[PDB]
Amino acid sequence: HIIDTDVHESFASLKDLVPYLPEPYKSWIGNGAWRGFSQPFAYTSPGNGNRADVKSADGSASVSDYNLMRSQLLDPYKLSYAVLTGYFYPTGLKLQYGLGSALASAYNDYVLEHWISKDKRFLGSVQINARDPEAAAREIDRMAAHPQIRQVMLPVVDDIAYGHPMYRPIFAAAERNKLMVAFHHTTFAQGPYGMGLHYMERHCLIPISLMPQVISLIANGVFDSYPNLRFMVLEGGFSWLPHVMWRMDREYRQGRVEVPWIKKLPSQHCRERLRLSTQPTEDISGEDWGKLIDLMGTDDILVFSTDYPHFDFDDPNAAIPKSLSSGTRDKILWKNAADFYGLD
Amino acid sequence: HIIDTDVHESFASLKDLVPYLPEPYKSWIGNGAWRGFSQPFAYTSPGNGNRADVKSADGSASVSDYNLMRSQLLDPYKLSYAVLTGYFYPTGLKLQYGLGSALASAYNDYVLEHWISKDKRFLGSVQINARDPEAAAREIDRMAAHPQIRQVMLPVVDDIAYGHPMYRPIFAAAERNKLMVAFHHTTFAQGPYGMGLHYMERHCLIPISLMPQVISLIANGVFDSYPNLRFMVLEGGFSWLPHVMWRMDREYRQGRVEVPWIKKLPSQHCRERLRLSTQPTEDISGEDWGKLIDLMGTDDILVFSTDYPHFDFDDPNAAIPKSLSSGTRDKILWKNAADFYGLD
Ligand SMILES: [Fe+3]
Ligand SMILES: [Fe+3]
Ligand SMILES: [Fe+3]
Ligand SMILES: [Mg+2]
Ligand SMILES: [Mg+2]
């Protein structure tokens, strides 16, 4: 039993969405008025962000061929489930919201037709344009129909803290439709002072772009006001979570006159309803895993992911220390995710 | 012994700096053309950011009376040394660099005459305007000649990552003058998406404004370029340091080719020359302290501080768990700081 919570599929070409777009957007994209995203840095690994044996058609760090994924990932590792978390994140567009929203819908149509419908091991994400939270809510209502769709994907761009009350229609729609919430960094993710000055630094900063989302959701009452949502943060690490939990607890105890809508200790909200992917490895010893899980106070929090097809892919047979107890190992590799997605 | 690495003294009024200012800044400040900083949020603790029993003359979260510090902190605890870290950080001025630098200089004159020269337990910090690194370097040259001056303060404002090469004259001047480097957050410290929406969330975010300075300094070669410098990050916590060290090590291994100037593993750099204060408390058990020290791989890193006179003052007799070994406790309470400042 293995569930993979982070897999990056994509179209082969941006014009694959033209059949799904209404005019004028259809003509804008068909005639080349916008050519898509191009990450604002050079990858320093061979393979251009992917493993060396995976290329997408448009060059991005993704996979555009289901046959390649099935033959490299799904079948060889005998995955029970693989969560498609996308890669084309229209929330990265900072103007022309009507365009970003039409791209979000068109992308979800494309993935349902050429991915999710091809394999029962897939669990799908609703991609959205979070800059129009009401349109995003309507796309969530649209796509929650399909029983394999299980979460909404909230992309971490440069300028959005998702606990801002502007975004509440998104979480209300997610809850309404029995979908969970997932967070993933974009090519625009940054620290307080930018992405740094080199690729290696930009990549060190990815955890720093994501810890404020946990802090934001809790301080602004997102956990308290949608009790049926669980929240999964992918690819930001987990070794920092003891500190984020203890810190939030201290600030809650000292400052609760200011935040009376928080009705549990932040650490308790997190143990109950926050999940963090294990990928990428920090190359940590087995006894160090056990210590960190102790400090977290539970083994319910970690979910396995490979992050196929990216360069720092986590081999399922080597990422999770086998010295861990069997109950904990089963939780990390599949039970924690299974409970998150309401499976079995 | 006990050495306090974080104590916030200030002037009683900004006009106290007039006697040290040249024209036209002398007249600007004396006549009230600028009235100083005023933090952009309401404190939610009784005490306006301070202990309920300490009030500064200008209303800021600091202490302006040496007699009060001596009888509330220096004498009652038998402090061997106290590091005056300031509070008024002119780097927060984002224009009129000439004025900002004259204020740094004036402030340093004030502190030497009315604070440092009054008590041999004080270690002093050079306050600067980091927006003009060449002027900042001349002020470091000017003040380093006093023996109690032992470090330069690098304030963490909203928009400065100190690893950017523009800042190298500051590190060059520190190393040349045999001073160390300390970082402290300002009232302008923030995360990637601002300082949040509540005071409690702004306070949660402080460690997020400080972790990127460790990442910036290492990735951009500050550690390797200035091997005789030691770096202290204050008030950011320390439970996050294992993640930051592990992450940076991982990024280094997979991306050396981009950063050949980094001659040691980031974790080794940190174990040897990065220090972190223990304040404020996260309320964690002695057992858990020992596990975190395990995860950093040394007990050389932590330095005690009270952060007098702030609301989350750490009492020297209760902040450091007693189940830790006496060696570790001695290192934390004074020996790590003594070696950092070149004392005893
Ligand atoms: Fe991923
Ligand atoms: Fe990735
Ligand atoms: Fe403080
Ligand atoms: Mg000196
Ligand atoms: Mg305290």
Author numbering:
A (entry chain G), B (entry chain A): 2 to 345
Describing publication, verbatim:
Dinuclear monooxygenases mediate challenging C–H bond oxidation reactions throughout nature. The protein components of AibH1H2 stem from a largely uncharacterized structural superfamily, PF04909, containing over 100,000 unique proteins that can individually function as either carboxylases, hydratases, hydrolases, or monooxygenases. Representatives of the latter enzyme class—collectively defined here as “amidohydrolase-related dinuclear oxygenases” (AROs)—include PtmU313 and AibH2,9,15 which employ dinuclear cofactors with different metal identities. Herein we utilize this “guilt by association” strategy to identify four candidate AROs that can each harbor redox-active dinuclear active sites. Each of the four candidate AROs can harbor redox-active diiron cofactors.
For initial studies, the expression medium was supplemented with additional FeII sources to ensure the formation of an intact dinuclear active site. Aerobic samples of these Fe2-metalated proteins were found to exhibit moderately intense UV/vis features centered near ∼350 nm, consistent with charge transfer bands classically associated with diferric FeIII–OHx–FeIII motifs. These features were diminished upon anaerobic addition of ∼1.2 equiv of sodium dithionite (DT) and returned following reexposure of these samples to air.
